Amino acid sequence: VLRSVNSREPSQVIFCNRSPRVVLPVWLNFDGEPQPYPTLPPGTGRRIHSYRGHLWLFRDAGTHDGLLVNQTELFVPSLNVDGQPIFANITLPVYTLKERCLQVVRSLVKPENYRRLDIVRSLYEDLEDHPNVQKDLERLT
Amino acid sequence: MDVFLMIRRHKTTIFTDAKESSTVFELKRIVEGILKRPPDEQRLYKDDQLLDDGKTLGECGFTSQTARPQAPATVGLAFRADDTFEALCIEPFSSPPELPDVMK
Amino acid sequence: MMYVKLISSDGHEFIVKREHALTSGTIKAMLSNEVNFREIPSHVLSKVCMYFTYKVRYTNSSTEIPEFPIAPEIALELLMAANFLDC
Numbered sequence: 001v002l003r004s005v006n007s008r009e010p011s012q013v014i015f016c017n018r019s020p021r022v023v024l025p026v027w028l029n030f031d032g033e034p035q036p037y038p039t040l041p042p043g044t045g046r047r048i049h050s051y052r053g054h055l056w057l058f059r060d061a062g063t064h065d066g067l068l069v070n071q072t073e074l075f076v077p078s079l080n081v082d083g084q085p086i087f088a089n090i091t092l093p094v095y096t097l098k099e100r101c102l103q104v105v106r107s108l109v110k111p112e113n114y115r116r117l118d119i120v121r122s123l124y125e126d127l128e129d130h131p132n133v134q135k136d137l138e139r140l141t
Numbered sequence: 142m143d144v145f146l147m148i149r150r151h152k153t154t155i156f157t158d159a160k161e162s163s164t165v166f167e168l169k170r171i172v173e174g175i176l177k178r179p180p181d182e183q184r185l186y187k188d189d190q191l192l193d194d195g196k197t198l199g200e201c202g203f204t205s206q207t208a209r210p211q212a213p214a215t216v217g218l219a220f221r222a223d224d225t226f227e228a229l230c231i232e233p234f235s236s237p238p239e240l241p242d243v244m245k
Numbered sequence: 246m247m248y249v250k251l252i253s254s255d256g257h258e259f260i261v262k263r264e265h266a267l268t269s270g271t272i273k274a275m276l277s278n279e280v281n282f283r284e285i286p287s288h289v290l291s292k293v294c295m296y297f298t299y300k301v302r303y304t305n306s307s308t309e310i311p312e313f314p315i316a317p318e319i320a321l322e323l324l325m326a327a328n329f330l331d332c
């Protein structure tokens with residue numbers, strides 16, 4: 001269902017990383033498989049060639065935490081007006097305090113040791129259930 | 142520009158925001174609305190420095206880029222009891238425990 | 246402006262805008278103007294209040310969003326508080 005369209009109509013795009021994370025751009029190919037592309041360091045930009053109807057999403061390259069692009073989950077390049085590229089502004093979401101705490105706890109505790117933490121079982125489960133693109137694609141469908 | 146503050150006295154902490162251009166006296170009116178004490182019974186501080194009523198929060202160094210929503214700047218507060226003002230007393234927050242082994 | 250008082254296990258009294266406290270469905274239920282938290286110490290509850298300020302300020306805003314900072318030493322206790330408060 002969620003897949004790029006094979007339009008062959010070029011669309012030039014600027015990926016702008018306005019987050020403090022290393023960004024992994026992910027292209028959804030014609031069968032809907034996620035294809036990872038080169039990462040963007042924090043604060044950096046890249047002018048890239050894409051196509052109309054193509055679907056992109058953006059993740060923290062290290063943790064796969066979710067990021068937003070133009071304030072939403074998916075970015076689809078559109079028709080260029082007057083030869084101008086489309087801007088893909090990549091930003092942190094306002095994570096819930098809970099998800100933000102899970103991020104920090106995950107970065108400090110090796111996964112073998114989640115169970116050793118003195119917290120209710122359901123928080124072990126929340127930590128183990130770390131962000132992943134597959135899961136989100138199932139969600140977004 | 143908004144500045145984000147914690148106004149602190151003893152074991153009391155008010156979270157609020159104000160304009161950089163607003164005055165110390167105007168902050169006292171804010172505290173008055175919350176703690177029911179008028180400006181003449183209030184002293185505001187930045188650290189140990191007593192703040193002048195007529196000055197802006199900006200002039201007293203509370204700026205949009207230092208007094209942030211996720212890291213607000215602290216304004217000290219003292220009340221007059223009868224004739225004289227109590228000393229500035231701010232109770233520290235509790236201490237975090239030691240990091241568990243598995244977080245080192 | 247309407248304010249509510251949130252009281253930490255160690256007696257610190259945090260006074261925040263009512264609107265901000267209602268970020269938490271748990272707090273909304275404890276109110277529906279003071280709530281005592283017997284398990285949340287001040288070094289955790291202060292951060293919770295900072296988060297309310299942060300969330301209200303940066304929700305539906307296009308000004309670049311900074312990272313919400315959480316020191317390692319408080320992260321575990323903040324997690325538990327966040328989970329209790331559903332925020």
Ligand SMILES: CC(=O)N[C@H](C(=O)N1C[C@H](O)[C@@H](F)[C@H]1C(=O)NCc1ccc(-c2scnc2C)cc1)C(C)(C)C
Pocket residue numbers: 006007008015025027037038039040046048049050051054
């Ligand atoms: C006609 C077509 O659809 N071609 C595809 C294509 O050219 N694509 C798919 C996406 O729309 C876009 F990725 C484009 C493409 O692969 N462009 C090359 C490209 C190279 C590096 C980068 C990035 S991302 C972060 N840094 C860089 C340098 C982005 C795009 C492909 C993969 C079948 C050859």
